[PDB]
């Protein structure tokens, strides 16, 4: 898929933006929003063709509510507001957010023109609320020093775990994206021993092995992440997550942002997380690391979108 | 579609070569030629295997007159010779040609190699009648510095728009490409100033952004050459264009060359251009860029072009 | 097909690592190599993820021997140990091997990496049998001096070449893989001039063009490994040879590696490489070539791979 | 030079970071601060061996301020803290710094890190005034669109502009290097045409051809920026000015940094800047673009910086 | 050393151009020529700077009738036209330049821009007279199939070998350059024999290593071209020649463009090239490549030639 | 210093040969060798030339006895046999070799490609006695799993450490090296924390930090291996290491090389890593690798290496 919006299965690159715009309640401001999102392909192209290889991508998110004031005749069976959380130690915030444009590319510059081009063409229709430069970090490591993305399904898992399918047949194709803006302790997770932050995340810091059945905690990150229902079939989410930061203000982040055919899948993870399974029994991540955004999106296929107005 | 003859899809190259030649009157040069045509795939690898990334492309394409010839009672629907136009300034000749050969790689010794390699394997069969070496020119500018390619399809679009379908099923997976060398007229053009430019083209100079409606002329290169059928459907077409030129010759060109599943569409597009829309409202372009060749090949699929002879 | 196990379809890479394995006779053993098989896209994920490229691959295959081990409830049709081959001249022996891990990648870390992980993780359960380091030699020649790989199928007939399909639907999405190491005698070859090499493999050396008909030899390596049916259809493997060796002592080697939907196929290459067609008329690539080795394993795909 | 603080003379990056730090009273603070940048091959080392390429280096700069605090008997010629400007229509500020570290490389990463791994060693002795991640914007061209660093010297003619030699013989090998963080007004300067801004300039705007002496406005950047003394010798600078921005704070910058073996020359260029020449006919650039920094650092040689303290 | 004119020692790229032009009678002509390339970094770095790694060079080459036009106060010591050759069978004719532009870069487009601008800024100044685009082909190879460039000198022997030092300092740090754009007959070249084309260049073709002293023939380019002093020190010459031509017209040809501080060793190595060493012994390359251009410049200084 | 046999101080690269060869005793042999590699860069040509980077480098080594067979009346100051080292648990043997090549390329196939033309050129002249491929490991790291190499000197330093100079001045620009070929036992390293294994080597494993000196042991790999003298003047060597192994073989390893103007260097180096300091405080990553070669060379300059014979 060269220069086609709402690619989600892209594989991962060396640059990133991520931006989180609120809508005008004008219905001046609507209409130039859809006119926007609904030619994306546009300014897309206009950018993304100035470079041989095509890397740039942009997948455009519509937040639930502004979604009905588009759309009201049409809702995807899961979309909604992002579900905010209060657990035992942490809680993650639900804050504002109508339009996502996640975008991906082999260098920073046409990442930031087709942003640019986004937010002008945009002009006070929408207002930027949240905005994040991510960042390849070494050999694809989060700023926690762990090699990040690794269990990702990829292929037609990758599509299953990913793309509306039959089971929501007028939405073929489309996703729901969440991501949170997570900051993180530096000094603390650093007082840690390498075994320690192993023992939280579960797998080897260096070699990104995941730790055998018997020395996993059943609090590591990824057993908490790991998700069987019934019949004992596993339920994967596709994560897109890049690190940035700020040297003088000393944060060091990580963006996440994972896609799901349905965000249960998506939102039990975050439960499982924040509350803890056993009940109590949560994600030591997060005691390193705390949600400043959180936020719920739905990705529409390339023809969803292109009709919108 | 790795070192497979007749991928008309491939995103845009480095380096290409446009061969165009004539066949001999005899048996045995249109035996030779169907030899050479229908085993493309031999020198194809023969040099694009050399190259580790397998970048090298090669499309091959058979005049109207020549498909007679060796295929009389089966023809493709909508296969004539190229179809000249005359307005009362610019015109689009018609002009002889048989075989093209559309090499694409990433460099130019491939390119070259094989091109070499056909034009040996055809020897007195046939004669190269117009030969053009492409190259890319900055960030996929043209010669009279605009992004060039912008607006063509990718994915499911090109295919859709550039490859015969259930219409005509006996060909389908062929197309309809068609040729014309350009050069233009530097001096004139560069009496413009950027703002015309950007009005006889539809889009902005350097930031290569579409003109928004109000400003955008209605005989601009990009207004004449949309095609919105009554029912609203727009219908595309894919180009390969490339620079190419000769600095002692004062040659500075554009070789255009367009692919379609239906050569209606380009051709309704070359006569919006030469003739206007309304009628005498011509693109500007032409003012700029003269027209010396013009050719029109079918190309068919793998398995039709395998059969010949 | 990024970071997937059983990529029979990766195009050629700069670098990769053929191993082949021995099992333990144990059932502990037998359930160790089954659990290290069956997770393989864990390390192939656990290494390859590091890549920003993603060029990473894997495929395992399985010996029949081994695979009745761990499944005598079904077999692929065509699963069975590597057929030795005496011929007039030459001979290509059937040598031990329970399972091959074939690796490739664009950086040799990555394959060696990925080797160290899988041999760590396999323990006392297995032992390596054989092991070479291909690389990718100039613009993709083999130390004999000829472009290698050139008439490999592509994209669509590269799937029906190697691919199982309709014809074994249990094991569709699987294959057949046959591996030789072969050890050139580098002088010998050498004493022939270019001319007389080409007429060997039947194509030109420095450009890589097929020989025309009649100056190709009815022994040459392109004549004999042109396998064409009685109704005319042509059936074709795919080769991922890459060249290795040793400059001490004075090993180099064609790591010839084949796949194919019905190893038949390539099984009637090799007796018609090593026994002539028509008989005595062998390929003439033997007399600078020596197979030490022989193995042939069924390639199972994701699914059934993942269900061991 | 791989790896080596104190290379001035390195080509230009994809990527850069700019930071300036003020220092703590204290003389733990001031001892601190001294191992840090005394010992900087350590870090750079350490981060910049990780990528084969070894593109990483370290520009280390101290504040006269500062310099004073930790070499009493010694200083260079020039070192003075930045001399601020007060023109017609626009003002240069000169605001706080003690040390600059110039960092470039390949990647982000490779610089965020180093910047991670200074920060984290200096801890509480110093605090992070400016911060900015500068960025190639595609043929290398600042946000205003045009080919940024085109005239800079290289080679023999680089070292000549840019490295203190036998005029000062015991700081030789060091530079004086100027950093302005520039912000720009985009809606302003859109307003103008290309050629508007190519006066304005002094160059073509795509193709990066200098105008002609006839056609080159008195007060073009480019003619107050070029430098002749008396005896008819020009005096040259060497930029290596990157682009930066925040798209939701609307911030598109031009990250000034000039390096010379006498800041003489470059604050003559600010004054013909500012003031004008003839005053009062100033540069239209600072129409289009405020100062919000404005400092000024001694480059010492490697030898010199090594031993401090 | 980047974006620099007159750096004759950079190393082989993807692609050049080569530009030679005849300036106009007129006293005007003369000022817009030295205008323009006087300031040749101008253009230069208005292209070269538009690439991250700066590839892009330029060399300017002035002829002697010319270099007379603006300089009869000093000259070169060697500076003088190009010496035609008429050889028992073959012959090297001279031909007409004023100046040459000697352009590489890693791209194309790169190349070509310079000359757009520097075709256009000279204006009716000048005419081009020979234009032709160089271009790598596969492993450093020339359209007859060997390496080529192989045994240039490097670094420091590349300086001594190239640069004019101390024997003509008013000109040090100049060079001088000699041009000829040869055409092949690749039939003829074809109905030889590997062997024979390594006997006539004087290595294996796709290995590049040198004939021994007893395998090498005493017509070999390789040992015609080699010139030892009779202290028994080599000369050398440094090339950076490309292939070109046209599929089209058949032109299939390799640029030759030789620089040396001293052009007597580059005109002794085509003396002994053209009518042979002993006469009548010339180089058998000649029997497939004939001369279509030949033209000496002399390559100022930077220094030098910023103030033409 | 582009494809010129003795190259010492080349980047690091991607790929390596070392060989280690044994001279026949005959006079034929001898007269051989010395034609071979006072003629190295007829290989160095022929091979390198055919990758446009250039990036092939090939240093040639003498061992001392073979030296005196060939340059009896003239012997650069220092040369002599490895100096073996016997300490309590762990020792460094020294083992037979006339001639080393080290050979670094960007990509296998050229040094082996060399390999085999000098191996093919020294017929029977020569027997290798060892061989080892190596190659780079993630980002610069051994096998042990450290980052590796992080402090050898650049630029002047590294001449002023690793080429003869006025000291020997027959021999300018020469050097002495020596080699060992390490194997490690992975499971023993693999028992020790990362924290413990840090406490080893004298930097942290993950970052590649120098560990201050308070929590710096004193056996540490990185304090026994500096090497200051009673004048406080440091002594820096130049390594060029690289891993390599054997899955089947369960080889993992650390080819040691270190070039120094003065073996004196790195042999005092071995004797505080072998023999510890104070006596018995040996370095702790000699518990988990066991060196199998220990061989010193003589690295002429080219002029002295042209001359052979
Ligand atoms: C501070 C934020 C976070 C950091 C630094 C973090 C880091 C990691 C790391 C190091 C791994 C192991 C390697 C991999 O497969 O990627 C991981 C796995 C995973 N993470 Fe997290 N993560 C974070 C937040 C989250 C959140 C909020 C979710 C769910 C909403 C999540 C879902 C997962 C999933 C599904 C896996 C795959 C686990 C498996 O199946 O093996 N991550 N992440
Ligand atoms: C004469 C030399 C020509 C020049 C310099 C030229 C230039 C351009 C440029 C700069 C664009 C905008 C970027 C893009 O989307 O490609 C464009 C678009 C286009 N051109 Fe031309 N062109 C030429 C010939 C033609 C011809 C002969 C045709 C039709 C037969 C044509 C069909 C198009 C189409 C279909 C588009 C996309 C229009 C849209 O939907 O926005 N081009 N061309
Ligand atoms: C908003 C800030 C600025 C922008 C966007 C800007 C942009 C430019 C551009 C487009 C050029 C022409 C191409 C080139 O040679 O780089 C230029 C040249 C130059 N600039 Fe500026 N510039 C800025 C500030 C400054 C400042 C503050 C100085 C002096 C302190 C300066 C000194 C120069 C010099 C010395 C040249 C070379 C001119 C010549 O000799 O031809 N720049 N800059
Ligand atoms: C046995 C296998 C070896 C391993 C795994 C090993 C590992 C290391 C590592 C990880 C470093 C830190 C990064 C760097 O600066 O290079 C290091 C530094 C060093 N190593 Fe070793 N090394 C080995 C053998 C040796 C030997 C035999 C010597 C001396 C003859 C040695 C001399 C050094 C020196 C001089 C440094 C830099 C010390 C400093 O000034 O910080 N290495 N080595
Ligand atoms: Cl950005
Ligand atoms: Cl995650
Ligand atoms: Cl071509
Ligand atoms: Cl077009
Ligand atoms: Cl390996
Ligand atoms: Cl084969
Ligand atoms: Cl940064
Ligand atoms: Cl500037
Ligand atoms: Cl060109
Ligand atoms: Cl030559
Ligand atoms: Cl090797
Ligand atoms: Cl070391």
Avoid at 118 to 127: C, D, E, K
Wanted: proline share 6%; glycine share 8%.
């Amino acid at each position: 898929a060269r220069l086609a919006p709402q690619a989600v299965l892209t594989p991962p690159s060396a640059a990133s933006l991520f931006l989180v715009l609120v809508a005008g309640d004008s219905d001046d401001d609507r209409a130039t929003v859809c006119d926007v999102i609904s030619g994306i392909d546009g300014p897309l192209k206009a950018v993304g063709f100035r470079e041989l290889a095509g890397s740039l991508s942009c997948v455009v998110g519509v937040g639930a509510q502004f979604w009905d004031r588009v759309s009201a005749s049409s809702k995807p069976a899961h979309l909604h507001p992002f579900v905010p959380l209060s657990g035992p130690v942490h809680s993650a915030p639900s804050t504002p957010g109508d339009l996502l444009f996640h975008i991906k590319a082999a260098r920073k510059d046409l990442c930031f023109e087709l942003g640019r081009q986004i937010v002008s063409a945009l002009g006070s229709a929408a207002t930027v609320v949240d905005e994040v430069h991510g960042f390849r970090y070494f050999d694809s490591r989060d700023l926690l020093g762990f090699v990040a993305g690794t269990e990702n399904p990829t292929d037609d898992d990758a599509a299953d775990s990913a793309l509306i399918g039959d089971e929501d047949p007028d939405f073929r194709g489309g996703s729901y994206v969440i991501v949170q803006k997570y900051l993180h302790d530096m000094s603390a997770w650093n007082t840690l021993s390498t075994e320690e932050q192993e023992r939280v995340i579960g797998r080897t810091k260096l070699e990104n092995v995941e730790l055998d059945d018997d020395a996993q905690p059943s609090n590591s990150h990824v057993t908490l992440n790991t998700i069987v229902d019934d019949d004992g079939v596993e339920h994967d989410i596709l994560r897109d997550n890049m690190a940035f930061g700020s040297l003088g203000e000393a944060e060091y982040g990580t963006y996440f942002i994972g896609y799901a055919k349905d965000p249960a899948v998506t939102e039990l993870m975050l439960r499982r997380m924040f509350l803890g399974e056993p009940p109590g029994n949560y994600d030591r991540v997060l005691d390193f690391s705390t949600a400043a955004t959180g936020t719920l999106f739905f990705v529409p296929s390339r023809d969803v979108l292109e009709s919108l107005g």
